[PDB]
Structure formats: structure tokens, C-alpha cells
Amino acid sequence: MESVTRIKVRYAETDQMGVVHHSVYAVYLEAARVDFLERAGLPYHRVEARGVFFPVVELGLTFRAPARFGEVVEVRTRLAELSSRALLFRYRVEREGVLLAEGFTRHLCQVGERAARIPEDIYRALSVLHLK
Amino acid sequence: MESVTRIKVRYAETDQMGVVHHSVYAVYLEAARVDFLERAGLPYHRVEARGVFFPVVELGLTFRAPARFGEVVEVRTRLAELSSRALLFRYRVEREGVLLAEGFTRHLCQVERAARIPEDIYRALSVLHLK
Amino acid sequence: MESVTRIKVRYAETDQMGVVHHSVYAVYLEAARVDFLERAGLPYHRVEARGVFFPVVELGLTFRAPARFGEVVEVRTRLAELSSRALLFRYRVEREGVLLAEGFTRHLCQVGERAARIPEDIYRALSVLH
Amino acid sequence: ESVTRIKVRYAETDQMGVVHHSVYAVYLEAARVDFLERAGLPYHRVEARGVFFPVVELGLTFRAPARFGEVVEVRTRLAELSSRALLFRYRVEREGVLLAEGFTRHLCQVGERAARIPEDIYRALSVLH
């Protein structure tokens, strides 16, 4: 429960069963992750502008209750794991106390088309957010 | 000169009304357009590879009948307009003789900076378009 | 009334050319439209729940300049035309006063599972905010 | 068991020039719908009978990217089957190279509540499990 990102469900994101399609959640996770990084003073667009990337190597999502058009969801994200070459975010998607789904995204760090260590200045800033 | 691209509707593409969301149609037109260029011997991934791009500058769609999950749609595409700087594609989205939607897409050419359509590419496109 | 919807571009919405894919704009116009209906005292989820629908019969977009990840865009929406059985919305997608795209969406009104006239109460409400 | 060939769409590519990780779930869904089709269970027909296979969990591991211009193949099999749940495992490949692997876990919904997979449907599935 470090940062919270509010997301208003979009009509286009609902499926035939009348709920947010399960593939949409990864996008919600990305939005929250991006917001987290920005709030930490590491706006992601500026990171990639330096030739630094945090590509997703693994995704995991458990859907407990659905989100629907007309609702607003809150995505809580924190940096659960941080190493010199990788990061792991964990998320909780809820609506007014009710957990809707929970998941995580494992990332590697890419600098100039190659897996590498997270540059110092970015590592330093992220470290403050990671509990050692 | 018209080409047909068949697309099986994906579950993810339908909305609450139980039909293919209207925003998805543009993606259908894209796959059809890419299919059209590929058949013409102009695989778009290769066109961009050489630094040439056909950005969309105008989109238009009229929805007559919905498409539903479990169906296969057919997209007929043809190059309606061609110039040394722009292109206009028109389409018909149908399902077994029924017209679901019609529209178009106008494009410009970039090499990012605007530019005329490169010769070799223009010659090919030209064979697909007639005044 | 003119609603203004601030949209933060998502990484998932940008394509290979490093810009927001043209197909995404329709989703933007839809979100802005929803906002507009909300401010019009007609939250769409509640309208739909009533069995009333506003399906899109026509869409039109002109793209003048790209939007990119890291940017926030504003979509100004106006109810351009209103008839007993239809409505036409017009939009402007801008970034810092710079017009990136403009378009419209034409809708019909479906009651239950049939194309019909816009319910009086909803029509009246729309005939005052514009 | 099942093999679904999918042509990467331009709209599916991201700034890094590869297919966005969120698209993969959509690929798994088409491959899954295909697998059901091949088992004599066209999904649209299933839902029409008031039977659904909502996703309760998803997992994906990305080894190599997919790019526009390429065609990928999703191999899917029914790894787990019970009277109330299903577990599909997938492999996304290109020219024999593994791009990603994952799974989707499902519950069965008849009408509006979790329920046992109907007899005929379970039967057709157990044969492929």
C-alpha cells in the first residue's frame, strides 16, 4: 500500500459477460506502475528517453470479484522486490474496500537493447521505496 | 482491384451490448489494409523497416449491422485514391452477404518527416489504382 | 455545455511509431462522451441500466498531430445535433492548446432491444445542455 | 494438442517495437476458443446454452518478443480438469522458438453462479485432458 492509482472503468474495456475483460487488468496494472514511478520522481517516459526500459518478464493475476462500467477502481502498488537487474511490483485492485483482483509484474532492466543492471540514479531512487 | 480479408471475431473484441465494440473496427480495417499491402508485395513491416510510413490522417466508419463473437467477418478493401503524397482506402465489412459496416482511411507518407511516396512503392500501388 | 476530459496516455496505447494508435482515439472520444453525459445529469451506466442505449452508427476522425506516452490530452465534447431519434457529438483532442485531432460520433437511441426515439425525460435533459 | 496461428497486428505493438505484454492474454483467449472448437465445443454455442468459463487466474512468462511482420503459434492443452474447474497451459512460439508460456485457470458458470461443468461438456473435455 505505497501508492494508489484511481482508474475509471471505460466502456470499451467491458466484455460480453458485462465485466472488465481479464486482459484489461494488465493495462490497469501498467497505469498504476507508471503512476508509481512518476510519483517517485521517475516518470517512465523520461526513463525510456534515456534508453532505459523495464520490460515485463512475468505477469500474474488472480481475479476475485469483477469491476464494471460505471465504477472507479483503486490500484495499490508497491515495489516488492528490487535487485541490480530486476524489479517486482505487487498490486491490489479494489473498489471501496472490496478486493477485485491482485497480481504482480516481474521486470528486467533493458538499456540499449540489452539486459543490464539498473542505472545508479534510478537504482538509488527505487531503493528508497524497497524494504530491504 | 479488391482484396478480401477474413477475420474471426475475438471474445475480447465484444462489449456489454454483446457486439463488437465500434473502436475495434478500425483495427479490422488495419489488418485488412496490411493484408492488402502484403498481397501486393509491399509487406508494411518491410515498408517501415526502410523508414517509410503511411500514418492515418483521417478515419471514417458507418455501422449498419453488428458483428458478434462466434462469427467470421470479411473485409473487402480497395485503394480508392492515389497520389505521390497521399492514399485513400475504402472498405466494406460484411458477413455472408450482409453489410455490417463501411468506411475509409486516408494516409500520408513519412520518411520523422513528411515525404512523397518512394518510386518503387508508388509504381506498385499505381497498378492497384486506376483513375 | 462543453465538457473537458483530461486523459493521461497509457503505455499500452502507443504503437510502433511511438505515438497513440489511431484506433485508440475512438476509446478516448467514448470516455469523454461518458463524462459529458455524467455532467448532463445522465450517467450512462445508469441510462444503460434503465435499458436505454446510445449505439454508435457513425464515427469520423481527422488526425493532425500525434499524442505520445508521457503526455496528457484534453478532449472537449459538445452535443452538436439532437433529434427525436438521434444525436451527434463533436470532439476536439488537444494538448496544451494544440489541436491533435477532431471528430464526431453519430448515435441512435435503442430502447430495450429496439431502435427507438430518445425517452422524453432523457431528450428534455439533452435539449437544455448544449 | 491445439495449435493456433496468429498474425501480429500493428495495433498490438508498443513503443519498444514489440507486442505489448497485455496482448498475450488476448492471444491465449483465441487459442483457447480454438481448442474448444476442436473439441466439438464452439464457445459461442456454449455461452448460448447458458454456460461460461470465466477466468479466475492468469499467468504469463515472457522469454522472447513478438513483432509486427511475424506470425506466432499458440499451442494449448488442458492441463487440469475437475467437475468445477479447468486449467489451460500455453506455449507461444515462432519458427520453433519459445516466446512466452502461461496458463489460465477457469471456473464454470451456469446462469449466474459457479457450478459443475455440464455432463456433455465435461465428457468432451475429459477426452482431451
How does this model look, in words?
The structure is a homotetramer. By secondary structure, chain A is α+β, with helices and mostly antiparallel strands. Chain A is built from three helices and seven strands, in the order E-H-H-E-E-E-E-E-E-H. In chain A, strands 1-4-5-6-3 form a five-stranded antiparallel β-sheet. A two-stranded antiparallel ribbon of chain A has the order 2-7. Chain A starts with a strand and ends with a helix. Strand 2 of chain B pairs antiparallel with strand 3 of chain C, so a sheet runs across the interface. Chain C: GO terms for molecular function: fatty acyl-CoA hydrolase activity. Chain C: This is Probable thioesterase. Chain C: InterPro entries: 4-hydroxybenzoyl-CoA_TE, HotDog_dom_sf, YbgC/YbaW. Chain C: Pfam families: 4HBT_2 (PF13279).
